Amino acid sequence: SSNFGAISSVLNDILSRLDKCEAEVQIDRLITGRLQSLQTYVTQQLIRA
Amino acid sequence: FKCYGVSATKLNDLCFSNVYADSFVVKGDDVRQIAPCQTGVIAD
């Protein structure tokens, strides 16, 4: 539920308020942040297993 | 001018497959709307 420095934390709100060249950078920031979170969760799960 | 993707100084070295040039006459202040993904409805 965090925005990771983007203008909003909801992807549908990004795609309903920007065109296809100003929303790309915000989408990139969401991709990077959520990728980091998922990778961290996978690593903790591996050690606990 | 402006170059989007290839540096103009290093353009002299690399080789290309085919180059295409276009004839195009447009108003004076509209020249800044000829760019990838521009918001201009007239440009659209």
B43, A27 contact by CB (below 8 A): no
Structure tokens at A40: 């961290």
Q: Which residues of A touch B37 (CB under 8 A)?
A: 19-21
CA closest to B38 among chain A residues = A21
Q: Which residues of B touch A20 (CB under 8 A)?
A: 37
Q: Which residues of B touch A21 (CB under 8 A)?
A: 36-37
The reply to whether A21 touches chain B by the CB within 8 Å rule is yes
Return the beta strands (E) in chain B as ranges.
Answer: none
- What are the counts of helices (DSSP H) followed by strands (DSSP E) for chain A? 2, 0
What gap in Å lies between CA B12 and CA B5, rounded to an integer?
14
